[PDB]
Design a protein around this ligand. Sequence first.
Ligand SMILES: CCCCCCCCCCCCCCCCC[C@@H](O)O[C@H](CO[C@H](O)CCCCCCCCCCCCCCC)COP(=O)(O)OCC[N+](C)(C)C
Lengths: 70, 57
Amino acid sequence: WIARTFYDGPEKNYEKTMAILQIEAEKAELRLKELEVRRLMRARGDGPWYQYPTIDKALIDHSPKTTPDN
Amino acid sequence: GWVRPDLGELSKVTKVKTDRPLPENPYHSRARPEPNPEAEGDLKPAKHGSRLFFWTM
Ligand SMILES: CCCCCCCCCCCCCCCCC[C@@H](O)O[C@H](CO[C@H](O)CCCCCCCCCCCCCCC)COP(=O)(O)OCC[N+](C)(C)C
């Protein structure tokens, strides 16, 4: 009676644990991957991250400048 | 038979018939470095959320 009215079967807890373990394992591997990706982008600068501004080339004036040699 | 130019005539911008080829690279510039990959795609929710310590969202 106690088992019937207060508790559930073992399969429920077993499969809930399986799902929880999957979630945590993927989170751990994602954390490692993100750390490595951040390190690579900060070192190489070719990624979307750690992009530091440079001078906009639309500011340059391309006209004759009173002297032939610029 | 020389007629003296009027005011503001010698300051005109005029065109020149020349057979000298146009210099293709007058600045002697190198090759510009390749741009960043400029990734594009469709956004999806973050995998398991923020994944910051114990937070599940
Ligand atoms: C001879 C008898 C021998 C056995 C004695 C049994 C004693 C029972 C009292 C002790 C209870 C222990 C604590 C249990 C708390 C948790 C129970 C909880 O899990 O059950 C919930 C229900 O909680 C109960 O309603 C709590 C009862 C609280 C009262 C206990 C008895 C004493 C109450 C005294 C009140 C006095 C008031 C003043 C009177 C004048 C519903 O559970 P649920 O999450 O759905 O479960 C899912 C699985 N299902 C679907 C199979 C169930």
